[PDB]
């Protein structure tokens, strides 16, 4: 009963990368470490111009 | 008291954009000041090669070789990269 | 190569005679006067000045001209030009020696400084080895600094004899920059040593004086280390680069020379004009600088000799310097033509040996074929087909040596081929190729394959050949090289072919299995519960390419005829196959369908899976390969695969979340199984917060706390899971992949459906980075599990912020000791390899290196090839003297100990024969003499060992191959058995020689085997155990004689490299800096890669220097007897037993101003000095741990200083032990020097260096009186510092079983041979903690290599690479340029016998294929018609 | 689909699945020399030098560039440029030996020093082919190993069929339940 | 054979090689305290007559130098007092084949 | 960080060992 | 991380000149033993003196920040069990929000 | 107390009833997993027959 502060939401301990992983809290830590090195090798729409 | 944990984040600083430039701007701005001299020290009697700064800053952000030109790799190799445009996220 | 024939005869290089250029030759060789420094512009006119580069040398502009030599550009090695220097110079690299030499000879008259007269000298002048006979002569002359005129002869030291005159003192010398300076002495005289002078002196050095020093009268005089005429390398060495015309870009080297030239001139012009005497030597240094900075630019004399723009400059040396450079970058590894590379994938439809090449490549790679009547038809066909249709070609070549570009050349469609022409054609199905994946550190990383042109752009390979390459299809690029000759493609076909590689020499077992689908499925297909109906049964049958086309009679027929999975799969298994297994509950009716029986190629019973069809030893594959042939085997994978794969395709297989969710109750049952394990922790939590915790041998209370908590939670996970694992029905995919073993371990089950577990960092669960806690979401000093990092949820429920975070820290660990391990791993891997290159089994069956030096007089001490070996058991060793008799004992004279006639045919007509009980006994006394022999070797008692010829099976075959019946009796004469098995060994020849020495070594390399043999072919065994018949027997003998003879090693096998590879392979996979002990500091020992580093390096200061000592015979279980010696070794110092030291002011030596001290004094007076007292209270507790008595203590202190310091001391009964004493002009000061001299230089009981020591209860196995082998535990002491020499000569220890993990010592003390033993022993372990087997022979070889020479030769630049091995070979490792220099310096001569030696001269190296010459016997060539 | 590599239904590949665009873009300038000598953007041919390229210049206009619609391929030229040297040496820029496609957008601009500046952009379309790499969001990278069609693909009574087929053996040892759960 | 206790004078030792043929050796006491050659690891060596050697060579086509060497000062080399040249026949136990001959010249 | 460098920092640097044996006042960022 | 950020670099004096006017006893006139419970105050790594009863000196700064009078970036820490007041302004301090 | 201070720490470890030895064919073995390979293959898992003494890998 000393709580000075509270966390907005835990998720925020993550970085861009991981933030995209669904359920990272259901995988061997290392799996998420790799997936956050590939979403960088993937494709998409890097802008609209 | 135990020894001091060298790896305690609160004792780690992250030199970002500004700070970095800052450094540059100084060392550079001085080479200018010590060259403004060379004009007066010859005036036995418009001297500001503004290019020095302009070029310098490029070189740096250009390559990433901060500490400068001349005959020295002097700088920290690897600052200033080319943004990644692979995906929005990335 | 190089086109254009030349009268010149064609030979090979045999020797490489390194020497040094005498100025006279430099000119001689030279064609260019090379005067001007400019390049061309004859005043701008494009060409070249008769000045620099081409005043005749090679050329450019695509112009023949090269001193008529024409041949132009390609086909013309430049020619050397010279350039006379104005004043002599130093040779950057040789400065070293030029100096030392001077130090070895006085100037003026220039002569040695130590003749035959000085004795220490002689002893040097004899060492034959110009490399040490020098660094010796030098060590003896760097000191003499006066050219002695006369020295006492071999007679009276009163009579003086004269030699060479002038004693002009010799100057000491120091290296400043690039010049040599020396001083003369009384207030020095510092003057610079002018090169012009040094040279002179050298020039004056005698012939015998050259030689005596590491030199050569013809190829390398010292006078030539000083440059006088500079050889100027031609264009091809420093080629330009043209951007068409008017744009030229020259090479660095060309520039230096320029500067060197410039500098030179400006110097000369100064000696023929206003010569300001000492303003010249100011530019003479410039020459020296350039002339020096040109060859080398990475010196200590800082000036990098930069070239405008900050560009360093490329010193000639800079070019050869290893990796990315000349020697290691262009020669030992070249880029090559006829190579390809793309992404790879899996094709369950190709054969093992095949490799699906995509068309695209086939059409680009060409195999130059020779037009011959055999082909002309088919060949021309291609030619016509053009180079765009597949089956085609893309070049034709005539005898006139000229290309025909089939893609152009008007006469494309024309052309009539010719006998003797060649047609570079497209790679077509079935061409032999060299497939491969990097990185390559395995024989099995480059295997030949059958080409198989296919669509789409990806190289295709068979799954079961995935591991040898260790590749996955996650976008893994592989390479491919195409053979070029007919003999070349033969070396790939008959040697490097995938099927030829199925059994790995570095683990004497199969290296290729059966995975995923195929595997995971071959099981589902096997079950008793698996029945297949007609329709399908057929398609399968069909799928199998060798199906004798005989629909096999259905297992079932009754109403609906069915076939069992096992049944048809069996169609894949050839005939003559035999395999017995027996897992656990196995009983020739195996209810659980365990183990497995396969007869005459038919699965009789038992579920097929990993164990049966994997890369296991006695697996299906291992058999087939050894029983039928490499061929038959490869062809086997296919079938299985095809059959299986197909059935799987239709039975289907999946995986999903449903396979991770377990029975509702089993979840709670787990929850509480976790909670209960929390209290079992909590309990130990307060029980330690209330100081009620037994410290435990575990050292440190805290340390002892954890070890209990951890051990409590882990115990919970593993077990929390053991619940789910058993609750997951036999229909749960995950479990199925696990059962079949295709993928997954039960752990993976836990961590998914039960509970993750406790994370960790260096062992110690999550630490306190957050001042006395884990996360700011925690209360200080919380030691509970949920904070030290314990993930309670299963991967199914999902971690919590905290769990998640710790978990991370935990995993991210490996990903690191992989980033560093990787850095050193590589280096090890190479060194090993670069150390054992030249090691190959020669023709005498010896095992030598590029020199001739032996290193095993028999590969592996047994001349067997790793490929042919397995874990067979030595029945003779294990077992009680009781059973052994009940087994091999046959007594023909005894109703109860004779062969019951129901076995032998001539059984009853034997019982009694006395002539046979002579043999029958000769046998016994042997199996016996054996038993003893073995137990003297395999002391451990261990009976299972790697041995050629599997005799367990050879018989199993002999069994059902003659359908022998266990009912009717044999027909063997007991003479038959014994007298035969005796002749057998007579033929398992490994060595052959016609003389004794060898024929003796034979009996040796054979020994360990026969024992197994006789162990098996025991007269009592042969009949009562396996009913063999004369026939069967005589067969069994036949195979063995062969299977053995085949098991031998082939005189060629480059074992060196093989060995090497096999240690580095696993070396690479070793974990890094782990320490599982951490969390129990003080019991910390060095293990893992850092250790292995430590070894190969032959490092002195090892991190852990322990040494285990065992007691004397009897004195074993004598608990107390233990400490009794502990304290007899573990170094004990006064400082260890003291509790303080105090200096007091007590002037009355008859009463101490101290109360508590009274009683003492009074006692030492009933039964001069100084007033300054020094009082030392001691620890009682510390006087028992390591037994001791006041008397002893002081008694020592007293005999430490002796008569000159008065001492006294309380009695072992006083509540306070003490030691008073005074000295005997500053007393305090001196009474402090004696304060230290009393704590650190004073010993009590023990040996120096050996700090801590401890007792341990090891489980030794030993000969019971009854015969059996039993565990007779013993106490032992493990040091923690090491000084063998003396801990050996201590009473109570068995100085026969002593051992220091520091073989470095165990070598100095015990002697080399034992050293080795330790060495090998240490190494074996390093590698064996990973559970990584590596057939003795290899490590064995390595070890043997290190030792031999003399002591411990390290595997590093500082060692093996300095040996008597030729240049270039060593040249190819870490010291490249340096090496070469001191090579041509000492006139080295190269055998060109070492692989590298040849690979560098592009010649065929003596290796397997090249371990011999071939010839045409015209005389046998006649009789062949 | 074995060992990290999937079976991707071709049919859907055709219906547009995983198709990607890909733009590259060369660039050149008319270098200058204080002593008045300038490069140029023309369509040369022989005339002294000979130093040109094997490529087919025939796709260029007269300004030394290509125009959108065009369909470049092998080593065809893409930019015509000449340097006056003391006079026809090429400085033209071919399309990267291994690529091929369609020009897509060009543009000429001035570069501070008043130099001609061009940037050619050749676009291509790439379709999920076998050797191609793919992956989910749980480090489940794999490549294709073959394409099948609705006929060969396994089907569900519902009618549906898979776009992709991964091997279950890429699950246990890797224990990525989130992939499994995302599904 | 001379057995000193604490040490010998460097003035003394330099007198041994001054009376050939006869040869002299020197052992410290603390040295001989234990016979190393009895050690689990050390296996028995053996001297070879200047014939059994001229043979060993001949029968192995060996050049003196190609032979594995033992240090003159090698514990066991001393225990059997070898000379520059004599060869020893190290015969050890092997897990590959019970026995395994081997040799060692003396440098 | 950039903002900061521009607004403040930028100015502070210019004012230090500036003045010579000539001075430097404010600074404008266009 | 996402929420994380970084110090930019504030100015000291407005906190220095603020302190010595609320308790801090300049270091010029400090006397050890006279003050054992001396919770010496630190700012950007400098010892600008000490201060007696700090309990209040603290919750005064905290609420001084929470209003915006002391840049919400700047960090100040009270190491009670060591009697030290750590106040930082430094440019380069990673910080989240709670 | 001095005897005590003389004994060498006992690595205590659990034994799982679903893990087996290759010699002493008994279900009393201990294990510990480490990340030997890159982030694409994960968990090596080393075994140790806590009774007979053999060690090995699983991948
Ligand atoms: Mg990989
Ligand atoms: Zn020529
Ligand atoms: Zn002299
Ligand atoms: Zn076991």
């Amino acid at each position: 009963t000393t709580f000075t502060h509270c966390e907005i939401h835990p998720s925020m301990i993550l970085g861009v990368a991981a933030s995209i992983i669904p359920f990272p809290d259901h995988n061997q830590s290392p799996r998420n470490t790799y997936q956050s090195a590939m979403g960088k090798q993937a494709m998409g729409v890097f802008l609209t111009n | 008291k135990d020894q001091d944990d060298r790896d305690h984040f609160g004792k780690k600083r992250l030199d970002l954009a500004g700070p970095l430039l800052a450094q540059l701007f100084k060392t550079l701005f001085k080479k200018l000041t010590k060259d403004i001299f060379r004009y007066m020290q010859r005036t036995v009697e418009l001297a500001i090669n503004a290019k020095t700064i302009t070029s310098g800053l490029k070189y740096a952000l250009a390559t990433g070789n901060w500490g400068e030109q001349k005959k020295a790799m002097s700088s920290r190799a690897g600052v200033s990269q080319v943004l990644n445009r692979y995906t929005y996220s990335s | 190569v190089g086109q254009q024939y030349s009268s010149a005869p064609l030979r090979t290089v045999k020797e490489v005679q390194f020497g040094l250029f005498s100025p006279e030759e430099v000119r001689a060789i030279s064609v260019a006067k090379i005067r001007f420094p400019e390049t061309m512009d004859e005043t701008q006119t494009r060409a070249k000045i008769g000045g620099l580069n081409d005043p005749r040398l090679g050329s450019i502009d695509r112009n023949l001209k090269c001193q008529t030599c024409q041949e132009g550009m390609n086909e013309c090695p430049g020619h050397f030009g010279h350039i006379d220097l104005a004043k002599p110079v130093f040779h950057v690299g040789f400065i070293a020696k030029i100096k030392k030499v001077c130090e070895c000879v006085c100037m003026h008259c220039g002569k040695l400084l130590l003749d035959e007269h000085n004795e220490l000298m002689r002893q040097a002048l004899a060492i034959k080895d110009s490399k040490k006979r020098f660094a010796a002569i030098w060590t003896l002359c760097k000191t003499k600094m006066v050219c002695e005129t006369d020295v006492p002869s071999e007679d009276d030291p009163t009579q003086l004899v004269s030699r060479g005159g002038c004693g002009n003192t010799q100057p000491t010398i120091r290296k400043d920059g690039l010049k040599l300076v020396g001083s003369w002495k009384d207030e020095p005289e510092l003057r610079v040593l002018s090169t012009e002078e040094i040279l002179n002196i050298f020039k004056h050095i005698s012939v015998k004086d050259f030689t005596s020093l590491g030199f050569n009268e013809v190829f390398s005089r010292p006078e030539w280390m000083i440059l006088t005429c500079l050889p100027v390398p031609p264009p091809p060495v420093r080629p330009s680069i043209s951007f068409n015309e008017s744009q030229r870009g020259e090479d660095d080297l060309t520039f230096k020379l320029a500067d060197i030239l410039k500098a030179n001139i400006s110097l000369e012009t100064l000696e023929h004009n206003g010569a300001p005497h000492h303003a010249i030597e100011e530019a003479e240094s410039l020459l020296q600088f350039h002339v020096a900075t040109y060859m080398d630019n990475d010196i200590a004399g800082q000036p990098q000799a930069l070239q405008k723009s900050g560009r360093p400059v490329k010193s000639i040396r800079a070019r050869l310097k290893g990796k990315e450079g000349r020697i290691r970058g262009n020669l030992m590894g070249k880029r090559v033509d006829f190579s390809a590379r793309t992404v790879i994938s899996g094709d369950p439809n190709l054969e093992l040996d095949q490799v699906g090449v995509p068309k695209s490549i086939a059409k680009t790679l060409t195999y130059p074929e020779v037009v011959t009547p055999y082909n002309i038809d088919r060949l021309t066909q291609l030619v016509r087909n053009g180079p765009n249709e597949h089956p085609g070609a893309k070049y034709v070549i005539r005898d006139s040596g000229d290309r025909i570009d089939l893609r152009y050349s008007k006469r494309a469609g024309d052309i009539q081929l010719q006998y003797g022409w060649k047609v570079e054609r497209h790679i077509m199905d079935n061409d032999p190729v060299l497939f491969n994946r990097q990185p390559s550190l395995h024989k099995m990383s480059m295997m030949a394959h059958r080409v198989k042109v296919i669509p789409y752009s990806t190289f295709r390979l068979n799954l079961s050949v995935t591991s040898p390459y260790n590749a996955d299809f996650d976008g893994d690029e592989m390479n491919l090289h195409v053979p070029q000759s007919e003999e070349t493609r033969a070396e790939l076909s008959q040697l490097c072919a995938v099927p030829l590689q199925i059994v790995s020499p570095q683990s004497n077992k199969p290296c290729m299995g059966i995975v995923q689908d195929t595997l995971c499925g071959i099981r589902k297909l096997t079950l008793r519960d698996t029945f297949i109906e007609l329709d399908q049964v057929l398609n399968m049958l069909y799928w199998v390419p060798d199906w004798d086309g005989v629909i096999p009679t259905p297992a079932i027929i009754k109403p609906k005829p069915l076939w069992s999975g096992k049944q048809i799969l069996s169609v894949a298994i050839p005939n003559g196959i035999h395999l017995q297994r027996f897992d656990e509950g196995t009983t020739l009716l195996s209810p659980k369908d365990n183990g497995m029986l396969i007869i005459d190629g038919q699965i009789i019973f038992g579920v097929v899976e990993k164990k049966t069809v994997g890369s296991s030893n006695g697996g299906l594959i291992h058999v087939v390969t050894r029983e039928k042939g490499p061929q038959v085997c490869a062809k086997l994978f296919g079938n299985i695969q095809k059959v299986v794969n197909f059935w799987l395709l239709h039975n289907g297989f999946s995986t999903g979340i449903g396979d991770t969710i377990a029975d509702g109750p089993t979840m709670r049952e787990i929850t509480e199984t976790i909670a209960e394990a929390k209290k079992k922790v909590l309990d130990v939590t307060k029980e330690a917060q209330a100081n009620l915790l037994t410290a435990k041998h575990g050292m440190t209370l805290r340390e002892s706390f954890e070890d209990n908590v951890v051990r409590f939670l882990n115990e919970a996970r593993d077990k929390a899971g053991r619940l789910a694992e058993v609750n997951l029905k036999d229909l749960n995919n995950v479990k199925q992949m696990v059962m079949a073993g295709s993928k997954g371990s039960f752990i993976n089950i836990a961590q998914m459906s039960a509970c993750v577990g406790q994370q960790s960092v260096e062992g110690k669960r999550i630490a306190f980075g957050f001042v006395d806690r884990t996360l700011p979401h925690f209360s200080k000093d919380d030691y509970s599990p949920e904070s030290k990092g314990f993930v309670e949820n299963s991967y199914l429920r999902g971690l919590t912020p905290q769990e998640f975070f710790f978990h991370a820290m935990g995993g991210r660990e490996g990903l690191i000791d992989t980033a560093v391990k990787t850095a050193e791993t590589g280096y090890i891997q190479r060194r090993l390899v670069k150390a054992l290159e030249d090691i190959m089994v020669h023709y005498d069956n010896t095992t030598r290196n590029s020199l001739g030096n032996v290193i095993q007089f028999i590969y592996g001490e047994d001349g067997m090839d790793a490929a042919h070996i397995e874990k067979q058991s030595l029945d003779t060793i294990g077992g009680s003297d009781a059973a052994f008799e009940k087994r091999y004992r046959v007594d023909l004279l005894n109703t109860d100990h004779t062969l019951d006639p129901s076995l032998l045919e001539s059984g009853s007509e034997i019982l009694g024969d006395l002539k046979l009980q002579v043999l029958l006994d000769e046998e016994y006394k042997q199996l016996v003499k054996d038993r003893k022999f073995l137990r003297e070797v395999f002391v451990d008692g261990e009976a299972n060992w790697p041995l050629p010829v599997n005799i367990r099976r050879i018989i199993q075959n002999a069994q059902q191959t003659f359908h022998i019946d266990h009912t009717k009796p044999s027909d063997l004469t007991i003479k038959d058995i014994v007298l035969g098995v005796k002749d057998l060994q007579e033929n398992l020849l490994v060595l052959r020689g016609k003389n004794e020495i060898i024929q003796n070594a034979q009996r040796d390399a054979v020994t360990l085997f026969c024992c197994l043999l006789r162990s098996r072919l025991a007269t009592r065994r042969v009949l009562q155990e396996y009913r063999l018949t004369k026939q069967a027997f005589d067969w069994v003998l036949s195979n063995i004689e062969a299977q053995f003879l085949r098991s031998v090693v082939h005189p060629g096998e480059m074992v060196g490299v093989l060995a090497a590879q096999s240690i580095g392979e696993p070396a690479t996979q070793m974990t890094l800096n782990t320490f599982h002990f951490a969390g129990v500091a003080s019991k910390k020992v060095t293990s893992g890669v850092p250790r292995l580093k430590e070894i190969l390096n032959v490092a002195k200061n090892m991190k852990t220097p322990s040494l285990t000592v065992y007691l004397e015979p009897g004195h074993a279980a004598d608990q107390e007897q233990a400490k009794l010696i502990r304290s007899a070794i573990e170094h004990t110092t006064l400082k260890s037993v003291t509790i303080a030291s105090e200096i007091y002011y007590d002037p009355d030596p008859r009463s101490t101003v101290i109360p508590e001290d009274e009683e003492i004094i009074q006692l030492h007076f009933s039964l001069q000095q100084s007033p300054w007292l020094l009082r030392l209270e001691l620890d009682r507790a510390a006087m028992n741990d390591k037994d001791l008595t006041m008397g002893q203590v002081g008694e020592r202190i007293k005999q430490t200083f002796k008569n000159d310091l008065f001492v006294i001391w309380s009695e072992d009964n006083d509540e306070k032990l003490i030691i008073r004493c005074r000295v005997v002009a500053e007393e305090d000061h001196m009474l402090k020097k004696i304060e230290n001299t009393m704590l650190e230089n004073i010993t009590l009981r023990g040996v120096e260096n050996i700090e801590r020591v401890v007792m341990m209860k090891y489980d030794r196995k030993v000969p019971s009186p009854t015969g059996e082998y039993v565990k007779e535990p013993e106490w032992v002491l493990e040091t923690d510092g090491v000084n063998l020499s003396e801990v050996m000569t201590v009473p109570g220890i068995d100085p026969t079983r002593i051992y220091t993990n520091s073989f470095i010592d165990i070598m100095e003390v015990l002697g080399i041979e034992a050293g080795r033993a330790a060495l090998y022993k240490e190494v074996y372990n390093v590698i064996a903690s990973d559970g990584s087997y590596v057939n003795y022979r290899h490590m064995a070889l390595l070890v043997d290599v290190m030792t031999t020479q003399g002591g411990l030769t390290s595997v590093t630049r500082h060692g093996f690479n300095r040996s008597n091995t030729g240049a270039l070979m060593r040249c190819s490792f870490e010291e490249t340029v340096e090496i070469l220099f001191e090579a041509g310096a000492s006139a080295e001569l190269d055998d060109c016998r070492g692989v590298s030696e040849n690979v560098i001269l592009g010649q065929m190296a003596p290796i397997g294929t090249g371990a011999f010459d071939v010839m045409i016997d015209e005389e046998s060539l006649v009789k062949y018609m | 689909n074995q060992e990290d590599s999937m079976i991707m239904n071709q049919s859907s590949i055709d219906r547009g699945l995983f198709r990607s665009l890909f733009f590259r873009s060369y660039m050149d300038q008319e270098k200058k020399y204080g002593m008045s000598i300038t490069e140029t953007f023309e369509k040369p041919q022989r005339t002294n030098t000979l130093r040109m390229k094997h490529g087919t210049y025939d796709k260029l206009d007269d300004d030394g560039l290509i125009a959108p619609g065009v369909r470049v391929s092998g080593e065809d030229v893409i930019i015509g440029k000449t340097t006056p040297i003391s006079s026809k040496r090429d400085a033209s820029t071919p399309l990267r030996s291994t690529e091929n496609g369609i020009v897509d957008q060009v543009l000429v601009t001035t570069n501070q020093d008043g130099l001609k500046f061009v940037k050619v952009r050749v676009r291509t379309t790439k379709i999920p082919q076998i050797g191609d790499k793919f992956a989910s969001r749980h480090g489940q990278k794999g490549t294709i190993g073959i394409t099948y069609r609705r006929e060969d693909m396994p089907f569900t009574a519902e009618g549906i069929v898979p776009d992709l087929i991964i091997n279950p053996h890429a699950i246990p040892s890797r224990m990525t339940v989130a992939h499994l759960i995302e599904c | 054979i001379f057995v000193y206790q604490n040490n010998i004078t460097p003035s003394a030792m330099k007198l041994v090689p001054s009376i050939p043929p006869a040869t002299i050796e020197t052992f410290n006491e603390a040295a001989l305290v234990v016979n190393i050659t009895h050690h689990e690891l050390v296996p028995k060596h053996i001297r070879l007559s200047s014939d059994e050697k001229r043979e060993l060579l001949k029968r192995y086509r060996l050049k003196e130098s190609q032979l594995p060497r033992i240090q003159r000062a090698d514990p066991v080399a001393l225990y059997l007092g070898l000379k520059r040249g004599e060869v020893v026949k190290i015969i050890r136990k092997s897990e590959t084949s019970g026995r395994y001959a081997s040799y060692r010249i003396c440098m | 960080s950039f903002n900061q460098f521009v607004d403040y920092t930028l100015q502070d640097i210019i004012c230090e060992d500036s003045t010579l044996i000539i001075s430097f006042g404010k600074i404008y960022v266009t | 991380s996402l929420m994380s950020c970084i110090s930019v670099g504030t100015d000291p004096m407005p906190i220095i000149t603020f302190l010595s006017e609320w308790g801090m006893e300049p270091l010029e006139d400090y006397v050890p033993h006279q003050s054992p419970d001396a919770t010496r105050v630190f700012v950007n790594g400098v010892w600008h003196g000490v201060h007696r009863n700090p309990a209040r000196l603290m919750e005064t700064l905290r609420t001084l920040r929470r209003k915006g009078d002391i840049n919400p970036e700047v960090s100040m820490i009270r190491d009670i069990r060591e009697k030290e007041l750590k106040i930082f302004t430094d440019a380069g301090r990673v910080y989240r929000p709670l | 107390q001095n005897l005590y201070n003389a004994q060498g720490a006992t690595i205590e470890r659990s034994v799982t009833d679903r893990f087996t030895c290759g010699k002493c064919k008994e279900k009393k073995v201990s294990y510990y997993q480490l990340q030997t390979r890159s982030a694409d293959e994960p968990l090596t898992t080393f075994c140790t027959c806590e009774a007979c003494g053999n060690r090995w890998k699983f991948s």
Side-chain angles (χ1 to χ4, degrees), chain C residues 719-736:
Chain C
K719 115 168 187 175
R722 298 185 211 163
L723 304 181
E725 130 101 65
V726 187
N727 183 288
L728 287 185
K729 343 189 174 184
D730 265 68
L731 61 112
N732 177 102
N733 310 289
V734 188
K735 179 166 185 178
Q736 277 167 295

Side-chain angles (χ1 to χ4, degrees), chain C residues 1078-1129:
Chain C
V1080 163
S1082 76
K1083 191 53 188 183
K1084 299 183 175 184
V1085 178
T1086 303
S1087 63
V1089 166
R1091 172 70 192 150
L1092 175 37
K1093 180 179 189 182
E1094 224 160 60
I1095 306 186
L1096 303 157
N1097 281 295
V1098 164
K1100 180 61 180 171
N1101 29 294
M1102 24 213 276
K1103 294 189 179 182
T1104 290
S1106 175
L1107 102 78
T1108 278
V1109 277
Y1110 301 79
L1111 289 52
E1112 212 162 59
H1115 314 307
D1118 236 307
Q1119 167 67 294
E1120 192 179 69
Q1121 174 84 9
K1123 23 165 170 163
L1124 278 179
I1125 317 186
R1126 171 188 187 164
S1127 31
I1129 327 178

Side-chain angles (χ1 to χ4, degrees), chain D residues 133-165:
Chain D
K133 194 175 181 179
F134 284 88
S136 45
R137 312 138 73 183
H138 311 274
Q140 225 48 299
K141 91 231 74 184
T143 69
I144 303 212
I146 189 176
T147 31
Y148 286 54
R149 280 166 273 134
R150 305 182 57 197
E151 320 103 58
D152 318 318
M153 221 83 291
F155 62 84
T156 155
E158 277 270 317
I160 353 128
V161 76
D163 288 296
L164 200 27
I165 293 198

